[PDB]
Amino acid sequence: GSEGAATMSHTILLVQPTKRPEGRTYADYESVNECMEGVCKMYEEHLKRMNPNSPSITYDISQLFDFIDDLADLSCLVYRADTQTYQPYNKDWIKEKIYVLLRRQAQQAGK
């Protein structure tokens, strides 16, 4: 039961390895971190196969981005209630959030 309150934004996650339309797909999330999550996953899943025992996986956060480059171009849409609009960012912006997404994901503070 119980029901408080909490508002979030609508982020969009897409992936573009090549130029062809067949391969690129978009997703939807609530938080920015989550959005990025879909990205990191890309690697994780790709790691799983490589690391079976890997219960939680583990690798260089930079080595993960080594796969983001291979792609054609990674982008993300951030919704700013400010003007209720979506700003098309670059992969770098994602390569940054993701990293930070792993920062908090760990501990950081834990409020």
**CATH numbers and ranges of domains, the chain:** 1-111 (3.30.2260.10)
Q: Write the Ramachandran bin of 60: left for phi over 0, alpha for psi from -120 to 50, otherwise beta.
A: beta
Residues 104, 33: contact at Cβ < 8 Å? yes
Q: What's the CA gap between 61 and 52, in Å, rounded?
A: 19
Q: Are 49 and 31 in contact (CB under 8 A)?
A: no
Please list, in sequence order, all residues whose beta carbon lies within 8 angstroms of the beta carbon of residue 56, skipping any fewer than 6 positions away.
none
Question: Element (H or E) spanning 11, and its range?
Answer: strand 11-15
Question: Encoding tokens for residue 69?
Answer: 């480059």
What's the rounded Cα separation, in Å, for the pair 11 and 13?
Answer: 7
Q: How was this structure determined?
A: NMR
- 24 and 74 Cβ atoms separated by less than 8 Å: no
CA distances from 76 to 22, 56, 58 (A): 19, 26, 25
**Three-state secondary structure along 85-99?**
EEEEECHHHHHHHHH
Radius of gyration over every alpha carbon of the chain, rounded to an integer in angstroms: 15
- Distance CA(32)–CA(49), nearest Å, equals 27
Q: How far is Cα of residue 34 from the mean position of the Cα atoms in its chain? A: 6
